[PDB]
Amino acid sequence: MELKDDDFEKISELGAGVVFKVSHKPSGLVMARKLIHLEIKPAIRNQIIRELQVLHECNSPYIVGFYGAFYSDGEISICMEHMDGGSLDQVLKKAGRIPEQILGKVSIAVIKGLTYLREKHKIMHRDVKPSNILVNSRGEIKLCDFGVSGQLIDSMANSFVGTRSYMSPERLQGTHYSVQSDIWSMGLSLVEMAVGRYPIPPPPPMAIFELLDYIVNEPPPKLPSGVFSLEFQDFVNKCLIKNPAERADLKQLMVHAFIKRSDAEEVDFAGWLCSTIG
Ligand SMILES: CNS(=O)(=O)Nc1nccc(Cc2c(C)c3ccc(Oc4ncccn4)cc3oc2=O)c1F
Ligand SMILES: Nc1ncnc2c1ncn2[C@@H]1O[C@H](COP(=O)(O)OP(=O)(O)NP(=O)(O)O)[C@@H](O)[C@H]1O
Ligand SMILES: [Cl-]
Ligand SMILES: [Cl-]
Ligand SMILES: [Cl-]
Ligand SMILES: [Cl-]
Numbered sequence: 001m002e003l004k005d006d007d008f009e010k011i012s013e014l015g016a017g018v019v020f021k022v023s024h025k026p027s028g029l030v031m032a033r034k035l036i037h038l039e040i041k042p043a044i045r046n047q048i049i050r051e052l053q054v055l056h057e058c059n060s061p062y063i064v065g066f067y068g069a070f071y072s073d074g075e076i077s078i079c080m081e082h083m084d085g086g087s088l089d090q091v092l093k094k095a096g097r098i099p100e101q102i103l104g105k106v107s108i109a110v111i112k113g114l115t116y117l118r119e120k121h122k123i124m125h126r127d128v129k130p131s132n133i134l135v136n137s138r139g140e141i142k143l144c145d146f147g148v149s150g151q152l153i154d155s156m157a158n159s160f161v162g163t164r165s166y167m168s169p170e171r172l173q174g175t176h177y178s179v180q181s182d183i184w185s186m187g188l189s190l191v192e193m194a195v196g197r198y199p200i201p202p203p204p205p206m207a208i209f210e211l212l213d214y215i216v217n218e219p220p221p222k223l224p225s226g227v228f229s230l231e232f233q234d235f236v237n238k239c240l241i242k243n244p245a246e247r248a249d250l251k252q253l254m255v256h257a258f259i260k261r262s263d264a265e266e267v268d269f270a271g272w273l274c275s276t277i278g
């Protein structure tokens with residue numbers, strides 16, 4: 001859309017991991033602006049930008065909108081649709097835990113967005129988790145921050161950073177990345193949002209490396225025994241099977257009992273959202 005740092009103006013801050021809510025003055029648009037700082041050769045930087053341009057060709061109700069990416073002052077700027085609901089990670093804070101009928105809708109949203117990305121663009125997400133699922137007051141649930149640029153992925157070296165990991169056992173044992181890996185993350189995210197806390201380990205903090213080792217060695221987490229329907233339980237369990245061959249695939253999940261039910265349920269998500277978030 002041709003954006004430059006002069007066009008913009010900060011309204012507020014939305015969070016970091018940093019992202020501002022900005023006004024794009026020349027067009028009137030309100031956008032979310034992510035700044036990524038990288039100490040990198042100018043040459044690869046331009047390649048990231050070049051590669052982000054693919055986002056202009058994404059068009060799914062399950063995928064956050066993209067306005068453009070550019071470089072300025074040692075910052076990569078990625079400009080996006082502003083989601084006034086924030087991430088399910090933020091929502092999870094305010095709510096303590098998210099009800100399984102809401103998670104049913106989330107699951108459908110995620111499953112659809114993954115399948116759209118994989119089929120129309122042959123790309124995997126690579127980073128499915130509560131903070132990358134965004135919601136808004138129209139009740140929409142959308143995926144964000146997927147691995148669109150191979151250079152950006154390589155430059156960020158995300159596998160070793162942060163306190164939680166949603167990486168799969170195969171990948172941590174040298175397997176190529178595939179869709180089955182995003183399924184594990186979604187299952188892992190669903191359990192986190194259902195019980196109110198990152199499920200690894202089951203209930204001194206683990207640093208990233210003990211965590212990763214735990215993931216490849218210990219049995220997968222599961223939902224507690226009475227609070228949740230058996231259909232939800234089984235769904236999450238099919239997502240968290242350590243052997244990717246055995247783990248369910250998108251087609252299978254899409255016809256699972258839990259999803260067929262959830263798809264039928266009348267949930268007023270925007271309503272629940274706004275009387276949980278404000
Ligand atoms: C943790 N996973 S990893 O594979 O190790 N590291 C990475 N994983 C995923 C992804 C990335 C890199 C990456 C990021 C962070 C990104 C952020 C916003 C964005 O804009 C946007 N706009 C609208 C809708 C959806 N996105 C596009 C983006 O493209 C990318 O390739 C990893 F670096
Ligand atoms: N388009 C958006 N609209 C509204 N809020 C957003 C948007 N994008 C990101 N955010 C918020 O900004 C915060 C930080 O985003 P981010 O920079 O990707 O770190 P993170 O994904 O939350 N954790 P990490 O992936 O480890 O850096 C998140 O908690 C989001 O809720
Ligand atoms: Cl760096
Ligand atoms: Cl974290
Ligand atoms: Cl695959
Ligand atoms: Cl049941």
Ligand SMILES: [Cl-]
Nearest residue numbers: 139268269270
């Ligand atoms: Cl709704």
Ligand SMILES: [Mg+2]
Nearest residue numbers: 131132144145
């Ligand atoms: Mg994110």
